[PDB]
Design an enzyme around this catalytic site. Structure first.
Site, PDB file in Angstrom:
ATOM      1  N   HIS A  49     -10.553   4.884   2.075  1.00  0.00           N
ATOM      2  CA  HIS A  49      -9.235   4.514   2.621  1.00  0.00           C
ATOM      3  C   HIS A  49      -8.802   3.135   2.130  1.00  0.00           C
ATOM      4  CE1 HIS A  49      -9.162   7.626   5.727  1.00  0.00           C
ATOM      5  NE2 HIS A  49     -10.467   7.454   5.794  1.00  0.00           N
ATOM      6  N   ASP A  50      -7.501   2.900   2.212  1.00  0.00           N
ATOM      7  CA  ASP A  50      -7.035   1.571   1.797  1.00  0.00           C
ATOM      8  C   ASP A  50      -7.730   0.401   2.524  1.00  0.00           C
ATOM      9  OD1 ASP A  50      -5.586   2.215   4.203  1.00  0.00           O
ATOM     10  OD2 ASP A  50      -3.630   1.482   3.336  1.00  0.00           O
TER      11      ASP A  50
ATOM     12  N   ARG B 283      -6.514  14.233   4.436  1.00  0.00           N
ATOM     13  CA  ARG B 283      -5.780  13.691   3.270  1.00  0.00           C
ATOM     14  C   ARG B 283      -6.744  13.235   2.181  1.00  0.00           C
ATOM     15  NH1 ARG B 283      -2.118  11.015   7.210  1.00  0.00           N
ATOM     16  NH2 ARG B 283      -3.725   9.364   7.450  1.00  0.00           N
TER      17      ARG B 283
ATOM     18  N   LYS C 137      -3.093  -6.475   5.165  1.00  0.00           N
ATOM     19  CA  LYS C 137      -4.428  -6.109   4.650  1.00  0.00           C
ATOM     20  C   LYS C 137      -5.399  -7.291   4.637  1.00  0.00           C
ATOM     21  CE  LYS C 137      -2.995  -1.853   4.227  1.00  0.00           C
ATOM     22  NZ  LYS C 137      -3.239  -1.099   5.648  1.00  0.00           N
TER      23      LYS C 137
ATOM     24  N   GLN D 272       0.831  -1.231   0.000  1.00  0.00           N
ATOM     25  CA  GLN D 272       0.000   0.000   0.000  1.00  0.00           C
ATOM     26  C   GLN D 272       0.848   1.256   0.000  1.00  0.00           C
ATOM     27  OE1 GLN D 272       0.282  -2.070   2.550  1.00  0.00           O
ATOM     28  NE2 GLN D 272       0.563  -1.019   4.573  1.00  0.00           N
ATOM     29  N   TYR D 273       2.177   1.110   0.058  1.00  0.00           N
ATOM     30  CA  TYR D 273       3.061   2.264  -0.192  1.00  0.00           C
ATOM     31  C   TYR D 273       3.628   2.335  -1.623  1.00  0.00           C
ATOM     32  CZ  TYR D 273       3.036   1.981   4.982  1.00  0.00           C
ATOM     33  OH  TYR D 273       2.752   1.811   6.354  1.00  0.00           O
TER      34      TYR D 273
ATOM     35  N   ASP E 209     -15.372   4.207   5.653  1.00  0.00           N
ATOM     36  CA  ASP E 209     -14.377   4.026   6.665  1.00  0.00           C
ATOM     37  C   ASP E 209     -14.992   3.043   7.637  1.00  0.00           C
ATOM     38  OD1 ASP E 209     -12.054   4.340   7.966  1.00  0.00           O
ATOM     39  OD2 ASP E 209     -12.272   6.259   8.795  1.00  0.00           O
TER      40      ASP E 209
ATOM     41  N   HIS F 196      -6.528   8.100  -1.144  1.00  0.00           N
ATOM     42  CA  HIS F 196      -5.605   9.244  -1.244  1.00  0.00           C
ATOM     43  C   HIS F 196      -4.265   8.866  -1.909  1.00  0.00           C
ATOM     44  CE1 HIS F 196      -2.771   8.087   2.028  1.00  0.00           C
ATOM     45  NE2 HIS F 196      -3.778   7.972   2.876  1.00  0.00           N
TER      46      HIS F 196
ATOM     47  N   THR G 109       2.850   8.809   8.875  1.00  0.00           N
ATOM     48  CA  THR G 109       2.062   9.391   9.968  1.00  0.00           C
ATOM     49  C   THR G 109       2.998   9.919  11.062  1.00  0.00           C
ATOM     50  OG1 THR G 109       2.041   7.289  11.080  1.00  0.00           O
ATOM     51  CG2 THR G 109       0.308   7.595   9.521  1.00  0.00           C
TER      52      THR G 109
END
Ligand SMILES: *[C@@H]1O[C@H](CO)[C@@H](O)[C@H](O)[C@H]1NC(C)=O
Ligand SMILES: *[C@@H]1O[C@H](CO)[C@@H](O)[C@H](O)[C@H]1NC(C)=O
Ligand SMILES: *[C@@H]1O[C@H](CO)[C@@H](O)[C@H](O)[C@H]1NC(C)=O
Ligand SMILES: *[C@@H]1O[C@H](CO)[C@@H](O)[C@H](O)[C@H]1NC(C)=O
Length: 435
Positions: free
Chosen positions: A330-331, A135, A270, A20-21, A180, A52, A58
């Protein structure tokens, strides 16, 4: 490096393996058919679901990275070989905010959305919602910027008003937000994804830890330190230039096979945190799934999970007739939603201890499913060919064959069979276990 049409293609042997990065990269035709619009068909409705873009770590994580880099620099007597850059490296990342590169990924996404659905988008202003996170909202604004940039350059566009973000959905333990997760008590207490990810880290990291310390005499590292140095490769790459044109020096510290492990570590977190490996993961995607059924069939929402009954029954906040919808989520919720839709029902439960590739898992990995800037398109089309509408699902441009209905060779189902085959979400799955 980053293209509008294909996303990020710089050093892809490494940059596509950050889970996810990873910056979004197109998976058009990977384990799939063409994503082109079939001859004789016209799109009648498209839902977009987006994350996003690239961001700084963070606040929590930025402190942990800065404390580690700082400690290596404090303690090492020598910085050896590929680690010698740490002699002069200055930790300079901010926290939390989109990076300039991540902002541009979202402007790109809006341009690409317009270009792909131009024939529709020419006359339509999309209905747009965002989950209430700075974000996410900022990403929505950049996507709108790109959409309008593209639309106002097309002489065939007939309705050029810009869309507003019409609904900002609060993020809390007591607001029912389908973009979310928060209200499913038992799921919020779950530690399973963390336990799985930590078990896997404890298995793969030791050998890297030992080799890395020996390039830094005077330094002692832990398994978590290995993970933080690997994280640094994506975060420093997406911050250090405004276009992510320079791979960070952290990246070369680790081999290609080690990158595959890190990618897998992210896929496991995940899968066991939010996807089918968590007993209540897919339940977090049922609310949006029922919202999608309502939009595709132009019919009121039937749901008793994380919809809000008030918001779904007013045209201001939930119009049923809009032709284009775009929602910023969101992811983690996007992984729940994709599982709840049955899109990864060809994926066997992931090995908790051993790497399985995205292709072995029938298209599932964190980098193929929720990269920075991830988007999914869910289409209805009307064909001169066929005549019930047909539905198709694209996740980062890969046509993902639908489950629960008999798919054609283009990966489409009839809309009525699609919605009927979403029986698990229509039933509310195991939501009652939340309580
Ligand atoms: C539902 O939406 C209404 C109107 O915004 C809000 O006042 C109410 O708190 C929401 N309830 C839940 C549980 O989400
Ligand atoms: C973590 O590994 C331990 C040690 O073998 C094992 O007992 C446990 O079941 C693993 N936890 C998860 C959630 O898989
Ligand atoms: C919010 O979610 C909980 C169900 O999961 C439910 O009991 C309640 O009725 C919902 N409230 C609204 C306003 O939709
Ligand atoms: C995916 O498989 C699950 C587990 O067997 C099943 O409950 C669900 O209905 C399937 N979803 C679809 C859309 O076929």
């Amino acid at each position: 490096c980053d293209t509008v049409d294909l996303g990020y293609q710089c050093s892809p042997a490494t940059s596509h393996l950050w889970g996810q990065y990873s910056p979004f990269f197109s998976l058009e035709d990977e384990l799939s058919v063409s994503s082109k619009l079939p001859k004789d068909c016209r799109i009648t409705l498209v839902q977009v679901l987006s994350r996003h873009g690239a961001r700084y770590p963070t606040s929590s994580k930025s402190k942990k990275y800065k404390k580690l880099v700082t400690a290596i620099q404090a303690n090492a007597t020598d910085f050896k070989g590929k680690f010698a850059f740490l002699k002069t490296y200055n930790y300079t990342l901010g926290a939390d905010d989109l990076t300039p590169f991540g902002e541009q990924q979202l402007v790109n996404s809006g341009i690409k959305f317009y270009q792909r659905y131009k024939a529709l988008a020419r006359s339509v202003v999309p209905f747009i919602r965002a989950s209430g996170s700075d974000r996410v909202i900022a990403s929505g604004e950049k996507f709108i910027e790109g959409f309008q940039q593209a639309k106002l350059a097309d002489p065939g566009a007939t309705n050029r008003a810009a869309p507003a973000i019409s609904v900002i959905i609060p993020e809390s333990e007591t607001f029912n937000n389908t973009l979310d997760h928060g209200v499913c008590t038992k799921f919020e207490a779950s530690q399973l994804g963390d336990e799985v990810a930590a078990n896997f880290t404890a298995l793969f990291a030791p050998d890297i830890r030992a080799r890395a310390e020996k390039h830094l005499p005077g330094v002692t590292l832990t398994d978590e330190d290995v993970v933080s140095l690997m994280d640094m490769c994506s975060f420093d790459t997406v911050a250090r230039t405004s276009d992510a044109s320079q791979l960070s020096p952290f990246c070369q510290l680790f081999t290609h096979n080690e990158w595959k492990k890190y990618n897998y570590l992210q896929s496991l977190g995940k899968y066991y945190g939010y996807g089918a490996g968590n007993p209540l993961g897919p339940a977090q995607g049922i609310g949006f799934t029922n919202e999608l059924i309502a939009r595709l069939t132009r019919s009121p929402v039937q749901d008793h999970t994380s919809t809000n009954s008030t918001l779904v029954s007013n045209p201001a906040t939930f119009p049923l007739n809009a032709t284009m919808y775009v929602d910023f989520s969101h992811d983690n919720s996007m992984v729940s939603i994709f599982f709840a839709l049955g899109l990864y029902n060809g994926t066997e439960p992931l090995s908790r201890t051993s790497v399985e590739s995205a292709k072995e898992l029938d298209g599932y990995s964190a980098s193929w499913v929720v990269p920075f800037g991830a988007r999914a398109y869910f289409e209805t089309m009307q064909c001169k060919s066929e005549k019930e509408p047909l539905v198709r699902a694209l996740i980062n441009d890969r046509v993902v064959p639908l489950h629960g209905c008999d798919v054609d060779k283009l990966g489409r189902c009839k809309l009525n069979d699609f919605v009927k085959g979403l029986s698990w979400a229509r039933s509310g799955g195991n939501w009652g276990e939340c309580f």
